[PDB]
Design a protein around this ligand. Structure first.
Ligand SMILES: CCCCCCCCCCCCCC(=O)O
Ligand SMILES: CCCCCCCCCCCCCC(=O)O
Ligand SMILES: CCCCCCCCCCCCCC(=O)O
Ligand SMILES: *C(=O)CCCCCCCCCCCCC
Ligand SMILES: *C(=O)CCCCCCCCCCCCC
Ligand SMILES: *C(=O)CCCCCCCCCCCCC
Ligand SMILES: [Cl-]
Ligand SMILES: [Cl-]
Ligand SMILES: [Zn+2]
Ligand SMILES: [Zn+2]
Lengths: 21, 29, 29, 21, 29, 21, 29, 21, 29, 21, 29, 21
């Protein structure tokens, strides 16, 4: 999930965008 | 894990900005 | 509408804290 | 929605809980 | 009053930084 | 109070210090 | 201890939300 | 104090409430 | 003008995230 | 400036990028 | 380094408050 | 730079002020 992906490594805005509706 | 709690707070702010009008679910688990 | 955008930034911060491990959903108007 | 409910008046913590999953 | 609520969120952040180890007191209207 | 003083005008850092303990 | 400084910033935001009209003192030491 | 309690372990909103006026 | 001050606080947070390693410049009115 | 542009309307991420260095 | 990313977010908020009308550049690298 | 100085040690507002325009 988002915490395992983006709290272990910096997620760019493009990677974060995957979690949007 | 407090650092995990702190990271999540910043995650949600970033999703708010990126997703814009789309909205988002925040599903930590 | 910028003021709505600023309100929503605070709403998602509050939902993150209130909702805990359940997470939350945010959809703007 | 949450914007119409909680940007026009202050929502209590229990009102905010309606937007949890 | 939501705008007062948003102002106060920024005021406590500022007090935290200004006041350092003294801490601060926050009382809304 | 701080709300009446610092939400109606921008308070300087030294004005904010009046609300430190 | 920077991580302590960062944690305190989030603490004060959470107290602002929980305490509401009650207000709070932030007394780190 | 609040930093020793809530920066060493996650404090819920109910635990934070102890620090309110 | 307090509302401008609150808007700018959110703008610098957004620039930090958008601009990445480039950093950014912030100048108020 | 950014205040006049992005406090009077919501700026997109690509509009915000104009204020990166 | 996520903790570095989180620290920078708080740095920029603190510069916003300290610098006031002066503005600032944020130059991480 | 500011990250090496102020993410390795707490910078006071007076130290941060060095980075202002
Ligand atoms: C610098 C911030 C440190 C953040 C540590 C976050 C830990 C992420 C791994 C846990 C992911 C889901 C947790 C479950 O339970
Ligand atoms: C993930 C964030 C790490 C936070 C570390 C905070 C340290 C708390 C123990 C210190 C409590 C009072 C300090 C004194 O001085
Ligand atoms: C408690 C937060 C931990 C922050 C760690 C920040 C690391 C600072 C050293 C890196 C400085 C410039 C990085 C380059 O690349
Ligand atoms: C879409 O962009 C806007 C739809 C919702 C707008 C909300 C307007 C609410 C009242 C705010 C008034 C602010 C200053 C007069
Ligand atoms: C209690 O709920 C309110 C008491 C203080 C209210 C402050 C009103 C200040 C001016 C804000 C006007 C905003 C838009 C016309
Ligand atoms: C300097 O202190 C102010 C210069 C810029 C001011 C912006 C005014 C913009 C419109 C805000 C109206 C808010 C409520 C009626
Ligand atoms: Cl943090
Ligand atoms: Cl705001
Ligand atoms: Zn705000
Ligand atoms: Zn943080």
């Amino acid at each position: 999930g988002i915490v395992e992906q983006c709290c272990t490594s910096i997620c760019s805005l493009y990677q974060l965008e995957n979690y949007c509706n | 894990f407090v650092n995990q709690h702190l990271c999540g707070s910043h995650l949600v702010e970033a999703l708010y900005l990126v997703c814009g009008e789309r909205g988002f679910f925040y599903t930590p688990k």
